[PDB]
């Protein structure tokens, strides 16, 4: 199920998550949260949990691009205070 994730954190706290190519059934060509930093804003929030497929972050559509590209998308907003993601649990 789709769900708009909202991770309110501070700069210098990237997010704390690991993404990979969606090799699953491929419902949506995106990335998969294969890992998460149990302590950062990712685990603190709770809205984000391993086994979810992230489509777009703050507008940055990932549904289509490779893994390296997606990684760049997130690592780019390493100084964000609110991560608005649209993933599917």
């Amino acid at each position: 199920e789709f769900k708009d994730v909202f991770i309110e954190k501070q700069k210098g706290e990237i997010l704390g998550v690991v993404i990979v190519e969606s090799g699953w059934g491929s419902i949506l060509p995106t990335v998969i949260i294969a890992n998460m930093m149990h302590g950062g804003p990712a685990e603190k929030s709770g809205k984000l949990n391993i086994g979810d497929q992230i489509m777009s972050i703050n507008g940055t559509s990932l549904v289509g691009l490779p893994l390296s590209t997606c990684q760049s998308i997130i690592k780019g907003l390493k100084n964000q205070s609110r991560v608005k993601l649209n993933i599917v649990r």
């Binding site: 990237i14 997010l15 704390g16 998550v17 690991v18 993404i19 294969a34 890992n35 930093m37 950062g40 990684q71 997130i74 690592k75 390493k78």
Partner: peptide, 4 residues
Amino acid sequence: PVYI
């Protein structure tokens, strides 16, 4: 595995 490089965390974002």
